[PDB]
Amino acid sequence: VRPLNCIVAVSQNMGIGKNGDRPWPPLRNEFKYFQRMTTTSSVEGKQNLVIMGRKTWFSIPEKNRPLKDRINIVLSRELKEPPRGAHFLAKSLDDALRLIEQPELASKVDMVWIVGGSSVYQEAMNQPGHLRLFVTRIMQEFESDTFFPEIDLGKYKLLPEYPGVLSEVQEEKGIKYKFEVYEKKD
Ligand SMILES: NC(=O)C1=CN([C@@H]2O[C@H](COP(=O)(O)OP(=O)(O)OC[C@H]3O[C@@H](n4cnc5c(N)ncnc54)[C@H](OP(=O)(O)O)[C@@H]3O)[C@@H](O)[C@H]2O)C=CC1
Ligand SMILES: CN(Cc1cnc2nc(N)nc(N)c2n1)c1ccc(C(=O)N[C@@H](CCC(=O)O)C(=O)O)cc1
């Protein structure tokens, strides 16, 4: 509820998403890792929190909305009322970060995950605090619309190992990828 965790899947050419969906073909095993990672809280009773941009919200299949067992906060400057399924709606990453720290919430939130938006990722990283990046490395080049900020290895450190995460190369539908975890604390 204090450290922030970004979770993204990026291609070799640091690309994410392409025209509404992801540039690469659907990787079912990568969704499982995404599901398990953002869904598993470390405490019984308390749930995980996921924050995402509005385009990301409507990208999730309607029947998989809201992401189950997780508190879903949608960010939007245009919407004035939370979209069906949305627990909370926030005007900005601060409105959201200050809401999450309210006594009323903190009592029921364990981990907070930023899961969607090149813009949200960017503003999440552009600010002090214990921050962690869970990156799924798609070992292949794809053409992408939107992208992901470069990782200053002078600011973040690669965790040799992290609990609950496996580090061996994975492969599905002929596409290779591996899980990585970076950390920053300032
Ligand atoms: N595989 C992966 O790792 C991921 C891929 N993607 C893909 O990326 C695409 C979405 O990219 P992107 O264009 O960045 O969309 P996002 O949904 O992340 O951001 C777009 C919208 O999010 C809201 N928003 C973003 N930042 C803020 C902020 N700081 N404060 C308030 N509101 C904010 C906006 O509200 P408003 O509209 O009202 O202005 C904005 O128009 C999709 O095609 C998706 O499938 C997304 C996440 C992960
Ligand atoms: C569009 N999109 C955004 C998306 C996709 N892959 C990512 N992968 C990673 N690693 N990180 C992200 N932030 C990420 N974001 C989606 C789309 C669908 C579902 C979804 O329905 N997820 C179900 C998973 C259904 C399943 O695939 O088992 C869940 O309960 O988490 C999630 C995110």
UniProtKB/Swiss-Prot annotation:
Annotated InterPro entries: DHFR, DHFR-like_dom_sf, DHFR_CS, DHFR_dom
Top EC category: oxidoreductase
Pfam families tied to this protein: DHFR_1
Effect of substituting residue 31 to W: In L-5178-Y cell line; methotrexate-resistant; requires 2 nucleotide substitutions
Keyword terms of this UniProt record: Acetylation, Cytoplasm, Methotrexate resistance, Mitochondrion, NADP, One-carbon metabolism, Oxidoreductase, RNA-binding
Sites where the protein binds NADP(+): 9, 15-21, 54-56, 76-78, 116-123
A GO-annotated cellular component: nucleus
PROSITE patterns hit by this protein: DHFR_1 (PS00075), DHFR_2 (PS51330)
Catalytic activity: (6S)-5,6,7,8-tetrahydrofolate + NADP(+) = 7,8-dihydrofolate + NADPH + H(+)
Recorded metabolic or biological pathway in which this protein acts: Cofactor biosynthesis; tetrahydrofolate biosynthesis; 5,6,7,8-tetrahydrofolate from 7,8-dihydrofolate: step 1/1
Main function: Key enzyme in folate metabolism. Contributes to the de novo mitochondrial thymidylate biosynthesis pathway. Catalyzes an essential reaction for de novo glycine and purine synthesis, and for DNA precursor synthesis. Binds its own mRNA.
Family per record: Belongs to the dihydrofolate reductase family.
Name of this protein: Dihydrofolate reductase
